[PDB]
């Protein structure tokens, strides 16, 4: 459904296996190789919300075990590729933000 499968990895910055919209990301020039990861398991039916009825109203106020060992399988294959070039773990752990004087039409990502 025209979505991008992404991961943090979850060990680095706490972002799980997820899908995002391609119009809501910035493709940086930083590139790592993801060969050696078996992502053909995931599809549109892998992420189902189990839609809620109108009667169940949350007045005041969990995770799939299949999802958590799938995350643990993929992120240990990603971090082995991360350890080759230096400072990528720190780069992926740090957040992105615009400082004073940053012009996004002149910035290269």
């Amino acid at each position: 459904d025209n979505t991008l499968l992404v991961t943090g990895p979850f060990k680095v910055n706490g972002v799980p296996l997820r899908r995002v919209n391609a119009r809501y990301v910035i493709a940086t020039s930083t590139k790592v190789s993801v060969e050696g990861v078996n992502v053909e398991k995931f599809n549109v039916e892998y992420f189902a919300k189990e839609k809620l009825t109108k009667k169940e109203k949350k007045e005041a106020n969990e995770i799939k075990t299949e999802r958590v060992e799938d995350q643990k399988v993929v992120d240990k294959a990603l971090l082995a590729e991360i350890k080759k070039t230096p400072l990528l773990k720190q780069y992926l752990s740090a957040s992105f933000s615009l400082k004073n004087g940053d012009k996004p039409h002149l910035l290269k990502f």
Binding site: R23, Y24, S97, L98, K99
Partner: protein, 106 residues
């Protein structure tokens, strides 16, 4: 860190107008940093949010948002034209407003 801004600041200057007749359906936005239409062409199609506060809590918040988008450039100095779902209230001439980086082409 200490900064978390993921948008570009801008100012709501005025409506689209002639010398004596204004048009509230199109607003004029000064994005900071850009001083030419060729640099302003990067920001076309980006979403704009005007974020303001009110005393009465409506749906869990006292902060209300008005959404819009950049449509075209205006003039020679990087001012852009913007259209909103409901037009900006014209007391916000000179008020700050947020230009987000989505929908991104990069």
């Amino acid at each position: 860190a200490e900064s978390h801004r993921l948008y570009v600041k801008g100012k709501h200057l005025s409506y689209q107008r002639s010398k004596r007749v204004n048009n509230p359906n199109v607003s004029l936005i000064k994005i900071e940093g850009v001083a030419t239409p060729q640099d302003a062409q990067f920001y076309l199609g980006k979403r704009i949010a005007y974020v303001y506060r009110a005393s009465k809590e409506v749906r869990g918040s006292k902060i209300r948002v008005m959404w819009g988008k950049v449509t075209r450039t205006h003039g020679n100095s990087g001012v852009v034209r913007a259209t909103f779902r409901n037009n900006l209230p014209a007391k916000t001439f000179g008020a700050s407003v947020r230009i987000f980086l989505y929908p991104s082409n990069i």
